[PDB]
């Protein structure tokens, strides 16, 4: 059992482990596009010889509150062979990649979790929330106040790549949770827009100057349209796209994976028709450098200047001063007024979870309720946190 | 077709309409307890003779942000005979009760809606959100940080009426959404705690000095425990009660109807085990007197003093100044900076919906994004808004 | 193994066999009302001692085409103990009751079949067709042509017994399939209109001068209303009752067991909303005396006078002359032009099945296609055949 | 927004709209065969540029009662972009095609409806009824009277194209509802008889000199055989084919979409085993020229000569005389004795719906019940109306 950066000779063994571990992993061509985002020394393997564990990170750009873009290490392709469970391989691979990520200068790492109970203990906190809305479009009527009461076109996705790329780039720079989507991932997205024999139906696009929706009819439920992606930069675009989707007269239901502040339900005379059918953690964050992360993000201007001492368990103790939408985080040995594990800070960081909610579970400990109200307000995001794309 | 306050002679016809309209309405004894909350002149009927429509309000006490208690008219028992649909009976009954409620001095009216598309047009906005959590208790493990790692007792509800009454009274005065629960409604709750032949199983209670949970095994799914009510005044009580519920070793699943900020998921090593299985509007609010309602509630101290001009459609135009957690609302003919229908104000009022979410659906119109951020912050509640009991 | 008319001493053994054979049979009081319709010598039992088989008939009045009412022997309470199958007990009981029925002067016998494959071989043919319609009332809109665009009242069934009795009496005399419903069966119907603990919900009535509907919410599906009985004497009544049922705004679906010519679907702008969810044989008929039955019923006036020779297998050969809506059936030894088993004649008799459909299955044999067209036309009923009540 | 006959340049935009509107539409090759049936000027498009609406008709030959074949315009490929709903595009396209169809000389138009509530208002009435029968073949036993108690062969459909073509041609000329099936549609049918990866299983044929059945095992339910098409010219063929289908000993169930007078249930000792699992409108008809349509069809000989005055709403008033199986329809200003919308006449026209059923819904208005009986009898079809193939 040894832990190494893989050589080219290791990749067939990594693709066998991948196929056996991930039901979405078709075969080696599955990985080509994503591999271009893995830096030199971004991957570790464990050999017993054969490959019994693997983990890597990709170079990403994540938008955080204040429209600040952070270099982010996206952990992905993590697998332990079913023959090698409970032998400390995940712990060993995560410790080595975290050493490399921190030494390389990334202030944050991120991942999407296969189960909820694994990554907390490695300092990742869930930072975005996925909300599935299912609309019974047969009853849906737009409110008299709704915008746009056509600027939308029904198009073939492959013929409008340029326009999708440009709208997404505007959206990802404005919204916390936004990720830069490189060219190779647009290649993969547009390849999945094709019908497959025995697989997905063809995807169609609704295109507005300031938004798009990509949707396909369900494989088996022919009265359900699933919107894979909806990116809108303006309220007018968001409403115009939903008017077009509610015009899919052959469907009974339209489902989308969105965020908890999606305004859709308020566009309709009956808010109850936009039903929440599923909710789950989206992106998880591990803050790698506490002061660099806290200083980088913008904070709410509504809260007056305040100072506190924050201790992150095994993460340092810092004097935190927040004023004029900005934070100064400096080392101190003064008594801590707030204490939390690293994972909790990652949950607070994009505004998805309130400090006072975490305090009520004792995940965040303070004796000052005023300080809690001030952190709740300051860490809030003006623009609601969304989830970009899974990795 | 005439609209009158009912005489005693009208009540058998009202109970026939009730039985035919409401599947929960067993018979006349169904109504006795609730009728004691209906004031003189709190009820209207439409006769064609026989009873073809009815509506009433009850005298309630609703807690709003800042622990302020408002007299509230609770609309209930609203029904139109299936023989008399689309003849303007609902409009006529709602206009007459709203006249009586406003003339009597209530600043707010409230209801629970049978469907989402009816009450918006009468100025009611959804003001609380019901979130059903279903926990797979076989996997649930408490986080190392969770409190209480027994102060809880398994008891017969009927033997501890005094202690439930006293805990609920503390909870309803502290939480926005809280309602005073009068003696007659405790009589009805404890009567429903009994097993019924062909109906519900017996209810049990978990009792802590500072909280209680009332739960029963599902009629048909014998591995599901449904928690009808959980009221906890402290974090320690909330965690101790959930430790006891996760100790129902004969169950697979525990379900509760709670609110979106319930800290339960953060108590567990796997936050995903507390699954959101259902979400719906809870209490709806109609603001009857705009300035009296806005002046009564407390506002967030974190936001600096600011002034604006708010226009409610057909509700008056007012100069609104919010500072030091308090608001002054006075009549003005100055140009409006914010405009919204009455229903939108009711949705904002307890902090359940953000002004910026309503603005993105064009339900709230302003040309100032700074003003929107300030209203979002000021209307926020420090204590998350919960739903008391249905009526 | 002996076959006898039961003594009073036999009835406890008959009620044990009944309880074990029929899931609807609660206990001895189940039978009291129905027993008053069983004549002296209307029942047979087989003893092995204990009761191992039973069968009886009731005295009924059946309406046939031309508004003619026939004395009818209604076979019911037929059971063989599970210990005594395949020993010829059913054959022995049916042969003895048929001897008694024919000797007593009944021209027809009738029954409702527990399975489709038993009674054909004893000369019963299915003569009515049950069609279940399920309406998604949320979408239902009445056509501009539909009548009545309120004469209907929502009432308690027990308070309007007189009016239901009088409407049903008019309906049963006008419609083929109609049965006289005696006082004891009204007592039983109105007793089933009560809610039962663990059983059915309370029944309500919609009452028009010229029709009624009795309906109840489903035990388990609380968004389904089941109409147990709808009797309307005029088109206006039928349409007015359906307007009231489509006004059950708390339901998603309304289901009724009706007949194939129910005009309901044509009342709606979308005929497809009245969905056929179930179809089955209703009343079965055994013609006991061929000439008396054929002479009694009226025939279509549109068909010109014609003569043929009909042979019923083991039922006699007759010269049949049909003209001016009337038939003369007289014995002959002349060559048969039409041949069929007794069961086929029972299927033709109320107009539910076409002679040309039975001919295409070779159940009716003729070499004359003109004769087939003439029988199809003559045996047709102007008023569509309905099913009264099960027995 | 302009309405034009499409140029070749319009067809890619029409195929995009088709793919987005119709789940069965695979791609451009989907349309080749069907396009050969569209005449010059048989298609309209709406451009906004891009294609936002389309509609066309095909040249068909429809059999009506009396074995008369009418030129029929088959409306198909009707779609409005989801971006352009509720703007009058369907009304505009239907008005233009109806002008072209009427000017070209077609006496009737026909379609298959995607929903039941759209085409009535454009004068189409449902004229055939689809009845799905599902047989539990494990219990099915043929009656002693059933024919053929082997002339049937199990064959590969592609090897017997000539024999299927010749049997179908005999069937379509004899049955009302029959359509000429041109060579290109046989090419498409036999191409769908092939297995597809991820799609349908291989089709097999049962072939008799005087009938055929094409059947395939269900994709997912491997104990269900679905009969796509059964065409039999004689009773012997129909019975022999069902004997072979009931010999599919590896199946539990055989399902077919047939018509309400299918004699199958009468072939079995238990008629209940042929269960009605689904019922729906099949072909819809718009009578374009009232007198030409009424004069063309044959009428029942059993009804004596009679005369009336029929008014079709916005369709003309005519003196109708029916005798000796023939009708004379001539213009008159005499008072109408019968009145109905154009759609109602289309529902009556092939004999699928009775005049007296439509009268009971007030869709057909007369003060003469004798006249109603005479129309019911005269419009009846001797050969039951069937549905040929969808388009
Ligand atoms: C992580 C799991 N996962 N992740 C990825 C992303 C990925 C693949 C390969 C490499 Cl080198 C880097 C990332 C993926 C890409 C294509 C198809 C399937 C997958 C997949 O199941 C989940
Ligand atoms: C409103 C509907 N509703 N509402 C109530 C509350 C209520 C009953 C009677 C009166 Cl006078 C005042 C309120 C209720 C009470 C017991 C049993 C059932 C119900 C019931 O279905 C829902
Ligand atoms: C025949 C079966 N069947 N039939 C009847 C009718 C009946 C009962 C008793 C006698 Cl003596 C005469 C007829 C019935 C009456 C009440 C409750 C249940 C039943 C019942 O299951 C079916
Ligand atoms: C009408 C809809 N519809 N209709 C047709 C018939 C058709 C296609 C193309 C043209 Cl130009 C003319 C008719 C069709 C043919 C192949 C595959 C799918 C379809 C299809 O979904 C239903």
Swiss-Prot record, chains A, B, C, D:
Activity regulation, free text: Is potently inhibited by several small-molecules that share an isothiazole S,S-dioxide heterocyclic core. Some of these inhibitors, when used in combination with KAN against resistant M.tuberculosis, efficiently overcome Eis-mediated KAN resistance by restoring the antibacterial activity of KAN. Some of these compounds also inhibit in vitro acetylation of DNA-binding protein HupB.
UniProt GO MF annotations: aminoglycoside N-acetyltransferase activity; identical protein binding; N-acetyltransferase activity; protein-lysine-acetyltransferase activity
Main location: secreted
GO biological process per UniProt: aminoglycoside antibiotic catabolic process; biological process involved in interaction with host; effector-mediated defense to host-produced reactive oxygen species; response to antibiotic; symbiont-mediated perturbation of host inflammatory response; symbiont-mediated perturbation of host innate immune response; symbiont-mediated perturbation of host programmed cell death; symbiont-mediated suppression of host programmed cell death
Catalytic reactions on record: L-lysyl-[protein] + acetyl-CoA = N(6)-acetyl-L-lysyl-[protein] + CoA + H(+)
This protein's record includes keyword Secreted: yes
Disruption-associated phenotype: No significant difference in terms of intracellular survival in U-397 macrophages and in an in vivo mouse aerosol model of infection. A strain lacking this gene induces more TNF-alpha but less IL-10 production in primary human monocytes than wild-type. Macrophages infected with a M.tuberculosis eis-deletion mutant display markedly increased accumulation of massive autophagic vacuoles and formation of autophagosomes in vitro and in vivo.
Top-rank taxon: Bacteria
Active site: 119, 391
Signal peptide feature range: none
Consequence when changing residue 281 to A: Nearly abolishes catalytic activity on AG substrates
Enzyme class: transferase
GO cellular component: bacterial extracellular vesicle; cytosol; host cell cytoplasmic vesicle; host extracellular space
Protein localization: Secreted; Host cytoplasmic vesicle, Host phagosome; Extracellular vesicle, Bacterial extracellular vesicle; Host extracellular space
HAMAP family attached to this UniProt entry: Eis
Family statement drawn from the similarity comment of this UniProt entry: Belongs to the acetyltransferase Eis family.
This protein's domain notes: The Eis monomer consists of three regions that are assembled into a heart-shaped molecule. This shape is formed by an unusual fusion of two general control non-derepressible 5 (GCN5)-related N-acetyltransferase (GNAT) regions and a C-terminal region. The N-acetyltransferase domain of Eis is responsible for its modulation of ROS generation and pro-inflammatory responses in macrophages.
Protein's name according to its UniProt entry: N-acetyltransferase Eis
Organism classification: Bacteria, Bacillati, Actinomycetota, Actinomycetes, Mycobacteriales
Gene name as annotated: eis
